Structure formats: structure tokens, C-alpha cells
Amino acid sequence: STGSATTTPIDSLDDAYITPVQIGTPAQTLNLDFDTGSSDLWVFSSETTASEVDGQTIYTPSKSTTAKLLSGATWSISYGDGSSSSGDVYTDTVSVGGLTVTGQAVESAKKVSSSFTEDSTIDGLLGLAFSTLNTVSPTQQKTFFDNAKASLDSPVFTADLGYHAPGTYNFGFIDTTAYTGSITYTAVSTKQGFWEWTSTGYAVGSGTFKSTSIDGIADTGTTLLYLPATVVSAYWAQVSGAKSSSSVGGYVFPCSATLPSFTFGVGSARIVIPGDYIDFGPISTGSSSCFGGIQSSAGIGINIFGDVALKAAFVVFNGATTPTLGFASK
């Protein structure tokens, strides 16, 4: 089997992407944030505290003839941006782009933090990291991909995120028309539960490539590219007037600037992020200070190849017995 679904930016600056997901019988379609940095499929629901729902589409398990309470199971998750959610668990039929999994754990939110309530465009998350990170207790549950894997034509999924435009998540096949050149594959460590890999270096604009190992994660659920402070300083030094602002929370730059590209290495291959991809717009409406798309990871503990980086590539998440990542230009 295969599946293919379009993913659409939630807003004008690609803060996140939403993909329609069919849950239950008859189908209830929710728009979920596919997140290769986490491993829970959770949804706003008829159980979510009413004051914490503001415009989201909810899953109502009592209206699904295939829903079953997973007795005793609870979940609770916190994300790198400080947001969180928690609740109980049903199993139900879940379909993405024509690919169907029966008995998928659908984690129903009883509580969500304010940032979720305040974002009416995201109805939940669909985790695509390794199932070792799934938070369901006392019986850990498998991700949608883990459940689908054995049925897929090939045990892979691909992320093809658009810049200010829709893109595609495919399951079970590589679309050889979706990229240019060749796909360069690179080793993955699953020891932290992430799609963790080592970039071979970087360049700023037309500058020379610096060969240096940068361990980080391929994370579709993170908006920005978070890299070591040395790398980030080297980038923003090429933008007149750019500076790190503690009050704003990162590097800002004059909105009048033209940003240089940023290149990252994948083995001997190179992925070029155009400068425009690094612009996240005025820090507040009407400001002439703009919030940068490359930020320091120093306070995180891990480097994160988020959407800024991934949207410059066609990315293969190869879930074979020994997982690997592939990157191609497009």
C-alpha cells in the first residue's frame, strides 16, 4: 500500500503545516501537524476542556462506530516550545492520503496548553519519530508509520514541504519526479528516539564551505533551523544590522535586508536554503525588525533541522531495519 497527502502552511510565514487525516467511522477529518520530532498522535476532542477549544475541529469518539476506549491508558506530552497536552486514549481507524491503519492509538486531549488553544488551525499532532518516545502509559503505543510500515510497498515516508506553498507527505514510495539530481542518504541514530543524523558542514551565502560535523534531528514539527552558536553567528554577521536580542528571543534583522542563503552538507552533497526562507517577518505588526529563521540551539541541548531546512529539500525518512535519512534538492 501507499498514501499521499498534501500538507499546507497554517499561515503566511509557514509557522507550521497541516495535513488532513481521517479518523473513525464515518470519517472525521482533522487537520494535524505531522511531527517527525515526536511520537504521539493526539487530537482535540469532545473530551477537551471546553474553555481550551477555540475554533479547532474535534474528534468525537462516541460518533465513531470503530472507536474503542483503550482502558486505563493516559498520555501527557511536553514539546520543545514549552507547550503541552494530555488525556486518555482510544483506538480507531486512521487514514492519511488513502493509507489506512486499523487500531491506531488516537490520544484524545482532555487538556491542552494555551498555545494550542490559541491556534485554531491545528487540530492535533501526528508523530512520526520513533515509537520509543510515545508517551502513552502504562502500555506504550506505536506511531501511525510504525503501524503502517509492514503494509507499505517500501518502509519509508517522504516530506516535501513547500516554501509559502503546499507540499506533500508520501507513505510507502519515493516519487522520483519530486526532486532533482540524486538523493544522498546518511546514517541515523535512534538512540534518543529521533531522526538524528550528522551534517557534514555549512556555508553562508557564496562563502566557502566549512567542513564540520553537526549532529541534529530532522524535525518537521519545529519551525526554525537551530544550530550551534558559532554557525549562527557566522550567518548573521553577513546581514548588516542583525543582532541577537534577548528581549525578542533570538536573532533579529532589519526588514530592509536581503538575506544570504545558507547551505548545509549531507555527505558530499549540499542543500541550499535560499535567503528568503530565513525571513519570519516583522517581530510585531508594523515593526521594521524581522525575526530570523536560523537561531542558536545553545539553550536546547540538540541541533534541530526544522522546516526552514527541510523545506529546501525532498527528505526521505527510511524506516528499514536500520533507518537512514535521504536528502535531495528540488
Ligand X SMILES: COc1ccnc(NN)n1
Pick out residues in 13-72 that bind ligand X (CB under 6 A): 15
Binding mask 170-209 for ligand X (x = CB under 6 A): ----------------------------------------
| Residue of 145, 251, 280, 305 interacting with ligand X (CB under 6 A) | 280
- What value, to the nearest 5°, has the Cα angle with vertex 161 and ends 160 and 165? 125
Nearest 5°: CA angle at 50, between 48 and 55? 90
Instruction: Collect all residues with Cβ–Cβ distance below 8 Å to 14 and sequence separation of at least 6.
Output: 161, 162, 163, 164, 223, 307, 311
How many angstroms separate the CA atoms of 252 and 287, rounded?
A: 11
**Which member of 39, 199, 296, 297 is catalytic?**
199
- Shortest distance, position 149 Cβ to ligand X, whole Å: 32
For this structure, is 215 an active site residue?
Answer: no
Q: Which of 67, 77, 204, 224 binds ligand X (CB under 6 A)?
A: 224
Candidate residues 105, 242, 283, 294; the one interacting with ligand X per rule CB under 6 A? 283
C-alpha cell at 261: 542563503
Q: What nine digits make up the cell of 66?
A: 470503530
Q: Is 80 in the site for ligand X (CB under 6 A)?
A: no
Give yes or no for residue 236 binding ligand X (CB under 6 A): no
Q: Does 291 bind ligand X (CB under 6 A)?
A: yes
Q: How far is the CB of 249 from ligand X (least distance, A)?
A: 7
Min dist CB 280 to ligand X, Å, is 4
C-alpha cell at 12: 503566511
Q: What backbone phi and psi angles, to 5 degrees, belong to 231?
A: -65, -45
Instruction: Report strand pairing: 124-127 vs 28-35.
Output: parallel
With contacts defined by CB under 6 A, how many residues of the chain interact with ligand X? 8
Rounded to a whole number of angstroms, the minimum distance from the CB of residue 222 to ligand X is 10
Whether 46 sits among the annotated catalytic residues: the reply is: no
DSSP H or E segment with residue 95: strand 84-96
Q: How far apart are CA 226 and CA 326, in angstroms?
A: 20
- Residue 275 C-beta-side C-alpha neighbours within 13 Å: 15
Smaller CB separation from ligand X, 176 or 288:
288
232 contributes a contact to ligand X by CB under 6 A: no
Q: Give the residue numbers marked as catalytic.
A: 35, 199
Q: Which residues bind ligand X (CB under 6 A)?
A: 15, 223-224, 280-283, 291
